[PDB]
Protein backbone atom coordinates (compact mmCIF):
# COMPACT_ATOMS: atom_id res chain seq x y z
CA UNK A 1 0.00 0.00 0.00
CA UNK A 2 0.97 3.67 -0.29
CA UNK A 3 3.04 4.43 2.81
CA UNK A 4 6.67 5.01 3.66
CA UNK A 5 9.45 4.38 3.01
CA UNK A 6 10.04 5.96 -0.35
CA UNK A 7 12.08 4.07 -2.94
CA UNK A 8 13.74 5.35 -6.11
CA UNK A 9 15.40 3.75 -9.13
CA UNK A 10 16.93 5.57 -12.08
CA UNK A 11 18.49 4.02 -15.19
CA UNK A 12 20.31 6.24 -17.69
CA UNK A 13 21.44 4.97 -21.07
CA UNK A 14 24.07 6.32 -23.44
CA UNK A 15 22.88 7.09 -26.94
CA UNK A 16 25.59 5.62 -29.16
CA UNK A 17 26.29 4.89 -32.80
CA UNK A 18 23.47 2.54 -33.73
CA UNK A 19 20.86 3.71 -31.20
CA UNK A 20 17.31 4.21 -32.44
CA UNK A 21 16.76 7.88 -33.31
CA UNK A 22 14.01 8.16 -30.66
CA UNK A 23 15.82 6.25 -27.91
CA UNK A 24 13.47 4.97 -25.21
CA UNK A 25 10.63 7.07 -26.64
CA UNK A 26 10.42 4.46 -29.43
CA UNK A 27 8.40 2.34 -26.95
CA UNK A 28 4.64 2.51 -26.31
CA UNK A 29 2.77 1.85 -23.09
CA UNK A 30 2.91 -1.94 -23.42
CA UNK A 31 6.61 -1.84 -22.50
CA UNK A 32 6.09 0.32 -19.43
CA UNK A 33 2.99 -1.60 -18.27
CA UNK A 34 5.12 -4.72 -18.01
CA UNK A 35 7.86 -2.84 -16.12
CA UNK A 36 5.27 -1.65 -13.60
CA UNK A 37 3.81 -5.15 -13.34
CA UNK A 38 7.16 -6.31 -11.93
CA UNK A 39 6.44 -4.30 -8.76
CA UNK A 40 2.79 -5.41 -8.70
CA UNK A 41 1.49 -1.95 -9.50
CA UNK A 42 -0.51 -0.44 -12.33
CA UNK A 43 -0.87 2.78 -14.28
CA UNK A 44 -3.56 5.09 -12.90
CA UNK A 45 -3.01 7.98 -15.33
CA UNK A 46 -0.66 9.32 -18.00
CA UNK A 47 0.58 12.64 -19.36
CA UNK A 48 2.80 12.82 -22.46
CA UNK A 49 4.80 15.54 -24.22
CA UNK A 50 7.60 15.60 -26.79
CA UNK A 51 10.22 14.80 -24.16
CA UNK A 52 8.57 12.80 -21.37
CA UNK A 53 6.03 10.06 -20.79
CA UNK A 54 4.76 10.52 -17.23
CA UNK A 55 2.83 7.85 -15.34
CA UNK A 56 1.09 8.00 -11.96
CA UNK A 57 1.00 4.54 -10.38
CA UNK A 58 -0.78 2.59 -7.65
CA UNK A 59 -0.62 -0.84 -6.09
CA UNK B 1 4.22 6.14 -7.39
CA UNK B 2 5.65 7.73 -10.46
CA UNK B 3 7.39 6.61 -13.63
CA UNK B 4 9.05 9.12 -15.96
CA UNK B 5 10.42 8.01 -19.34
CA UNK B 6 12.70 10.22 -21.43
CA UNK B 7 14.75 9.52 -24.56
CA UNK B 8 17.72 8.35 -22.47
CA UNK B 9 16.46 7.48 -19.00
CA UNK B 10 13.76 6.11 -16.71
CA UNK B 11 12.97 7.37 -13.18
CA UNK B 12 10.73 5.31 -10.86
CA UNK B 13 9.65 6.55 -7.41
CA UNK B 14 7.31 4.58 -5.19
CA UNK B 15 6.10 4.43 -1.58
CA UNK B 16 5.52 1.05 0.03
CA UNK B 17 5.95 -1.30 -2.93
CA UNK B 18 8.24 -4.30 -3.19
CA UNK B 19 11.83 -3.67 -4.28
CA UNK B 20 12.30 -1.56 -7.42
CA UNK B 21 15.26 -3.72 -8.38
CA UNK B 22 12.60 -6.07 -9.79
CA UNK B 23 12.23 -3.56 -12.67
CA UNK B 24 15.88 -3.50 -13.69
CA UNK B 25 15.78 -6.48 -16.11
CA UNK B 26 12.89 -5.15 -18.20
CA UNK B 27 14.31 -1.61 -18.19
CA UNK B 28 17.61 -3.02 -19.46
CA UNK B 29 15.69 -4.93 -22.14
CA UNK B 30 13.98 -1.69 -23.16
CA UNK B 31 17.43 -0.13 -23.53
CA UNK B 32 18.83 -3.00 -25.57
CA UNK B 33 15.80 -3.17 -27.88
CA UNK B 34 16.53 0.42 -28.98
CA UNK B 35 20.29 -0.33 -29.15
CA UNK B 36 21.24 1.98 -26.32
CA UNK B 37 23.76 1.08 -23.65
CA UNK B 38 23.12 1.20 -19.92
CA UNK B 39 25.46 3.77 -18.36
CA UNK B 40 24.13 4.56 -14.87
CA UNK B 41 21.87 2.82 -12.40
CA UNK B 42 21.08 4.50 -9.11
CA UNK B 43 18.89 3.38 -6.27
CA UNK B 44 17.90 4.60 -2.82
CA UNK B 45 19.10 2.46 0.08
CA UNK B 46 19.06 3.42 3.76
CA UNK B 47 22.11 2.19 5.62
CA UNK B 48 21.73 4.71 8.46
CA UNK B 49 18.44 5.94 9.87
CA UNK B 50 17.54 8.71 12.27
CA UNK B 51 14.56 8.83 14.66
CA UNK B 52 12.53 11.13 12.39
CA UNK B 53 12.70 8.57 9.55
CA UNK B 54 14.33 -3.76 3.45
CA UNK B 55 17.31 -5.73 2.17
CA UNK B 56 20.89 -5.26 3.37
CA UNK B 57 23.45 -3.36 1.32
CA UNK B 58 25.07 -6.68 0.49
CA UNK B 59 21.77 -8.21 -0.64
CA UNK B 60 20.82 -5.27 -2.86
CA UNK B 61 24.29 -5.11 -4.40
CA UNK B 62 24.17 -8.84 -5.15
CA UNK B 63 20.69 -8.55 -6.67
CA UNK B 64 21.63 -5.63 -8.89
CA UNK B 65 24.80 -7.45 -9.99
CA UNK B 66 22.71 -10.50 -10.90
CA UNK B 67 20.74 -8.44 -13.45
CA UNK B 68 23.89 -7.80 -15.55
CA UNK B 69 26.35 -10.18 -17.28
CA UNK B 70 31.70 -4.40 -15.71
CA UNK B 71 31.14 -1.31 -13.60
CA UNK B 72 32.00 0.67 -10.53
CA UNK B 73 29.73 0.90 -7.48
CA UNK B 74 29.46 3.27 -4.55
CA UNK B 75 27.47 5.90 -2.68
CA UNK B 76 26.36 9.22 -4.07
CA UNK B 77 25.08 10.88 -0.93
CA UNK B 78 24.74 8.43 1.98
CA UNK B 79 21.18 7.34 0.98
CA UNK B 80 21.68 6.66 -2.75
CA UNK B 81 24.01 4.27 -4.57
CA UNK B 82 25.24 4.07 -8.15
CA UNK B 83 26.50 1.62 -10.70
CA UNK B 84 28.50 3.23 -13.49
CA UNK B 85 29.30 1.36 -16.72
CA UNK B 86 32.10 3.37 -18.27
CA UNK B 87 32.60 3.57 -22.03
CA UNK B 88 21.45 17.97 -16.94
CA UNK B 89 20.24 18.99 -13.49
CA UNK B 90 18.64 17.32 -10.51
CA UNK B 91 17.49 18.86 -7.24
CA UNK B 92 15.77 16.83 -4.51
CA UNK B 93 14.28 17.73 -1.14
CA UNK B 94 13.39 15.48 1.77
CA UNK B 95 11.12 16.94 4.44
CA UNK B 96 10.28 15.60 7.90
CA UNK B 97 7.65 16.73 10.39
CA UNK B 98 5.15 18.30 8.05
CA UNK B 99 2.78 21.14 8.98
CA UNK B 100 -0.16 19.50 10.72
CA UNK B 101 -2.64 22.06 9.38
CA UNK B 102 -1.64 21.01 5.87
CA UNK B 103 -1.44 17.23 6.24
CA UNK B 104 -5.17 16.79 6.90
CA UNK B 105 -5.69 17.62 3.24
CA UNK B 106 -3.75 14.47 2.30
CA UNK B 107 -6.08 12.18 4.22
CA UNK B 108 -9.08 10.80 2.36
CA UNK B 109 -11.61 7.99 2.67
CA UNK B 110 -11.52 7.41 -1.11
CA UNK B 111 -8.82 7.11 -3.75
CA UNK B 112 -9.14 10.17 -6.01
CA UNK B 113 -7.21 10.76 -9.26
CA UNK B 114 -6.91 14.20 -10.86
CA UNK B 115 -10.30 15.85 -10.59
CA UNK B 116 -12.32 18.42 -8.66
CA UNK B 117 -11.29 16.94 -5.33
CA UNK B 118 -7.54 17.10 -5.95
CA UNK B 119 -7.98 20.59 -7.41
CA UNK B 120 -9.42 21.65 -4.03
CA UNK B 121 -6.48 19.93 -2.29
CA UNK B 122 -3.89 21.61 -4.51
CA UNK B 123 -5.44 25.06 -4.09
CA UNK B 124 -5.95 24.72 -0.32
CA UNK B 125 -2.37 23.55 0.36
CA UNK B 126 -0.59 25.82 -2.12
CA UNK B 127 0.57 22.98 -4.35
CA UNK B 128 -0.97 25.14 -7.11
CA UNK B 129 1.89 27.63 -6.66
CA UNK B 130 4.57 24.93 -6.96
CA UNK B 131 2.86 23.32 -9.97
CA UNK B 132 1.26 26.30 -11.70
CA UNK B 133 -0.68 26.35 -14.95
CA UNK B 134 2.50 26.33 -17.09
CA UNK B 135 2.76 22.63 -16.19
CA UNK B 136 0.73 19.66 -17.34
CA UNK B 137 -0.08 17.80 -14.13
CA UNK B 138 -1.73 14.67 -12.86
CA UNK B 139 -2.12 13.62 -9.25
CA UNK B 140 -3.57 10.99 -6.94
CA UNK B 141 -4.94 11.25 -3.41
CA UNK B 142 -4.76 7.89 -1.63
CA UNK B 143 -6.98 6.26 0.98
CA UNK B 144 -6.49 6.42 3.97
CA UNK B 145 -3.75 8.96 3.27
CA UNK B 146 -0.87 9.80 0.98
CA UNK B 147 -0.57 11.89 -2.18
CA UNK B 148 1.46 11.88 -5.41
CA UNK B 149 1.77 14.43 -8.20
CA UNK B 150 3.69 14.43 -11.48
CA UNK B 151 4.11 17.48 -13.70
CA UNK B 152 5.78 18.06 -17.06
CA UNK B 153 6.73 21.18 -19.00
CA UNK B 154 8.79 20.54 -22.11
CA UNK B 155 11.90 18.65 -21.02
CA UNK B 156 11.31 19.54 -17.35
CA UNK B 157 9.48 17.54 -14.69
CA UNK B 158 8.53 18.03 -11.07
CA UNK B 159 7.18 15.41 -8.69
CA UNK B 160 6.08 15.32 -5.05
CA UNK B 161 5.22 12.37 -2.82
CA UNK B 162 3.59 12.77 0.60
CA UNK B 163 3.31 10.12 3.33
CA UNK B 164 1.68 12.13 6.12
CA UNK B 165 1.45 9.53 8.90
CA UNK B 166 1.53 11.49 12.14
CA UNK B 167 4.29 9.40 13.73
CA UNK B 168 6.95 10.02 11.03
CA UNK B 169 5.42 12.36 8.43
CA UNK B 170 7.45 12.80 5.25
CA UNK B 171 7.40 14.49 1.87
CA UNK B 172 9.79 14.53 -1.06
CA UNK B 173 10.24 16.82 -4.03
CA UNK B 174 12.33 16.31 -7.14
CA UNK B 175 12.89 18.35 -10.30
CA UNK B 176 15.29 18.65 -13.23
CA UNK B 177 14.45 22.32 -13.80
CA UNK B 178 17.44 24.49 -14.61
CA UNK B 179 17.69 27.66 -12.54
CA UNK B 180 20.70 29.70 -11.61
CA UNK B 181 19.34 30.25 -8.09
CA UNK B 182 17.01 27.66 -6.57
CA UNK B 183 15.90 29.68 -3.54
CA UNK B 184 12.47 30.51 -5.00
CA UNK B 185 11.89 26.88 -5.98
CA UNK B 186 12.96 25.43 -2.61
CA UNK B 187 11.16 28.08 -0.55
CA UNK B 188 8.00 27.54 -2.59
CA UNK B 189 8.01 23.89 -1.58
CA UNK B 190 8.73 24.81 2.05
CA UNK B 191 5.68 27.12 1.93
CA UNK B 192 3.51 24.04 1.33
CA UNK B 193 5.07 21.75 3.92
CA UNK B 194 6.60 24.10 6.57
CA UNK B 195 8.60 21.11 7.84
CA UNK B 196 10.49 20.68 11.10
CA UNK B 197 13.58 19.71 9.10
CA UNK B 198 14.61 19.22 5.51
CA UNK B 199 17.57 18.39 3.32
CA UNK B 200 18.37 19.45 -0.25
CA UNK B 201 20.54 17.39 -2.59
CA UNK B 202 21.79 19.14 -5.75
CA UNK B 203 24.05 17.79 -8.46
CA UNK B 204 26.92 20.15 -9.22
CA UNK B 205 29.07 18.81 -12.04
CA UNK B 206 31.59 21.49 -13.09
CA UNK B 207 30.37 21.36 -16.72
CA UNK B 208 26.72 22.03 -15.83
CA UNK B 209 25.31 25.53 -15.49
CA UNK B 210 24.58 25.31 -11.76
CA UNK B 211 27.80 23.39 -11.17
CA UNK B 212 29.91 25.86 -13.13
CA UNK B 213 28.43 28.54 -10.87
CA UNK B 214 28.95 26.55 -7.67
CA UNK B 215 32.54 25.56 -8.51
CA UNK B 216 33.39 29.23 -9.16
CA UNK B 217 32.00 30.41 -5.81
CA UNK B 218 28.53 31.36 -7.01
CA UNK B 219 25.33 31.47 -4.97
CA UNK B 220 22.91 28.73 -6.06
CA UNK B 221 20.01 29.06 -3.61
CA UNK B 222 20.80 26.52 -0.86
CA UNK B 223 22.64 28.95 1.41
CA UNK B 224 21.55 30.13 4.87
CA UNK B 225 20.53 33.69 3.91
CA UNK B 226 17.41 32.19 2.28
CA UNK B 227 16.20 30.18 5.32
CA UNK B 228 15.92 32.55 8.29
CA UNK B 229 13.57 30.26 10.22
CA UNK B 230 16.08 27.37 10.00
CA UNK B 231 19.59 26.55 11.19
CA UNK B 232 21.97 24.89 8.72
CA UNK B 233 23.97 21.80 9.68
CA UNK B 234 26.64 19.58 8.14
CA UNK B 235 26.82 20.65 4.51
CA UNK B 236 28.55 17.81 2.66
CA UNK B 237 30.12 17.94 -0.81
CA UNK B 238 31.33 14.74 -2.51
CA UNK B 239 33.02 14.06 -5.84
CA UNK B 240 31.21 10.75 -5.76
CA UNK B 241 32.97 9.51 -8.86
CA UNK B 242 35.64 11.27 -10.92
CA UNK B 243 34.17 14.35 -12.58
CA UNK B 244 30.78 14.19 -10.84
CA UNK B 245 29.78 16.08 -7.71
CA UNK B 246 26.89 16.15 -5.24
CA UNK B 247 25.98 18.71 -2.55
CA UNK B 248 23.76 18.06 0.46
CA UNK B 249 22.53 20.75 2.86
CA UNK B 250 20.49 20.14 6.00
CA UNK B 251 18.22 22.56 7.85
CA UNK B 252 16.34 22.30 11.16
CA UNK B 253 13.55 24.64 12.24
CA UNK B 254 14.42 27.01 15.06
CA UNK B 255 12.57 25.75 18.15
NA1 LIG C 1 23.76 25.28 4.23
Numbering used by the authors:
A (entry chain B): 27 to 85
B (entry chain A): 401 to 453, 458 to 473, 477 to 494, 504 to 671
From the manuscript:
To facilitate crystallization, we created an additional deletion mutant TbAdoMetDCΔ26. Like the Δ16 mutant, TbAdoMetDCΔ26 had low activity either as a monomer or after heterodimerization with prozyme, and both were modestly (3-fold) more active in the presence of putrescine. TbAdoMetDCΔ26 yielded crystals (space group P212121) that diffracted to 1.48 Å resolution. A single TbAdoMetDCΔ26 αβ-monomer was found in the asymmetric unit composed of a four-layer sandwich with two central β-sheets positioned between outer α-helices. The N-terminal β-sheet (strands β1-β8) contains pyruvoyl at the N-terminus of β4 (pyruvoyl β-sheet) and is composed of residues from both the α- and β-chains, whereas the C-terminal β-sheet (scaffolding β-sheet) contains only α-chain residues (strands β9-β16). The inactivity of TbAdoMetDCΔ26 is explained by an autoinhibitory mechanism mediated by residues S27-G30, which block the active site. The G30-P31 peptide bond is in the cis-conformation, orienting S27-G30 into the active site. This configuration places F28 within 3.8 Å of the pyruvoyl overlapping with the active site of the previously reported HsAdoMetDC structure. The TbAdoMetDCΔ26 autoinhibitory residues are well defined by electron density and form extensive interactions in the active site stabilizing the observed conformation. These interactions include, π-π-stacking between F28 and Y243 and H-bonds between the side chain of E85 and the backbone amide of S27, and between the amide of G101 and the carbonyl of E29.
